[PDB]
Ligand binder design. Sequence first.
Ligand SMILES: *[C@@H]1O[C@H](CO)[C@@H](O[C@@H]2O[C@H](CO)[C@@H](O)[C@H](O)[C@H]2NC(C)=O)[C@H](O)[C@H]1NC(C)=O
Ligand SMILES: *[C@@H]1O[C@H](CO)[C@@H](O)[C@H](O)[C@H]1NC(C)=O
Ligand SMILES: *[C@@H]1O[C@H](CO)[C@@H](O)[C@H](O)[C@H]1NC(C)=O
Ligand SMILES: *[C@@H]1O[C@H](CO)[C@@H](O)[C@H](O)[C@H]1NC(C)=O
Ligand SMILES: *[C@@H]1O[C@H](CO)[C@@H](O)[C@H](O)[C@H]1NC(C)=O
Lengths: 91, 182
Amino acid sequence: TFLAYAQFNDTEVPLIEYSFYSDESLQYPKTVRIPYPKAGAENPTVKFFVVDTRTLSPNASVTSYQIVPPASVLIGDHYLCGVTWVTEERI
Amino acid sequence: TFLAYAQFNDTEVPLIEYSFYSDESLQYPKTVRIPYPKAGAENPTVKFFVVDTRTLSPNASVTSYQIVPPASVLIGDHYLCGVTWVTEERISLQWIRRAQNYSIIDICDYDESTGRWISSVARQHIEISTTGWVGRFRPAEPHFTSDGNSFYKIISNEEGYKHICHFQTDKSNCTFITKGAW
Ligand SMILES: *[C@@H]1O[C@H](CO)[C@@H](O[C@@H]2O[C@H](CO)[C@@H](O)[C@H](O)[C@H]2NC(C)=O)[C@H](O)[C@H]1NC(C)=O
Ligand SMILES: *[C@@H]1O[C@H](CO)[C@@H](O)[C@H](O)[C@H]1NC(C)=O
Ligand SMILES: *[C@@H]1O[C@H](CO)[C@@H](O)[C@H](O)[C@H]1NC(C)=O
Ligand SMILES: *[C@@H]1O[C@H](CO)[C@@H](O)[C@H](O)[C@H]1NC(C)=O
Ligand SMILES: *[C@@H]1O[C@H](CO)[C@@H](O)[C@H](O)[C@H]1NC(C)=O
């Protein structure tokens, strides 16, 4: 019935950058860039959504609900570390 | 339960512009700009949506469904000209081609399992004019029975006179209930 998913936002996470040389034919090395938070750095933020797939249709909007963490976690930086479907109506 | 609304898009409609002088204290006149389609110009486009208000919540997206006109109208420029709620699960939409000599009523039913509003050829009613335009200024509106199984609507007689015709929601032929040179 439902499709739950997480969205990660790495906008403020610093980028680690390093050269990748590739095949010998590549004249100029490329630079790989990855949002990677080192100790104490700005972290990705996360949002969790539950989509009701019963209404998905070409001319319908997506019915979705955002589930936010409890106040004791919402307070500061946090991570979503687990998801378990219990029944069709409980997550 | 539902809130239906139309969205008008005037992106490509040219603007009429004219000066507005305002109070004598205004040192420089203002230029008013309005998207206004003159004869033959690009027209606004329309989208019709039905919103299910039951799910409205700050942390929820909006649940809505766009109902498009029937194929014979969707085919070219058109206008939405009428919206009539029949029951909580049936809505009547009246569309008209830009030429305005061909209109169609599309009666859509809410499908509880998917939230879609479904149309069917059996529930569509066409009104055309070979000698002019449809209706007086626009096609007349349908007046449904409590159950929504039929409706009454003013249309032109075989004699050219506007009279009340009785339609079955799922049948194409109607029966005139009034007649005469008036
Ligand atoms: C309003 O209508 C205009 C078209 O007149 C839409 O603009 C187009 O948008 C798509 C998707 O963003 C682009 O690929 C096209 O290039 C745009 N065309 C032009 C001429 O701008 C616009 O998206 C519509 N707006 C809404 C909210 O429906
Ligand atoms: C991602 O986070 C940035 C702030 O760091 C914010 O400006 C932006 O809107 C977010 N993007 C989305 C889609 O949530
Ligand atoms: C969805 O809308 C498009 C026009 O935007 C139309 O071609 C299509 O038939 C619609 N889908 C259905 C099945 O109603
Ligand atoms: C909706 O999101 C807000 C975010 O501030 C949160 O406070 C609220 O608890 C959420 N709704 C509920 C109770 O699920
Ligand atoms: C409606 O008017 C257009 C002219 O814009 C014409 O092409 C078409 O044949 C007319 N249709 C009818 C039913 O008279």
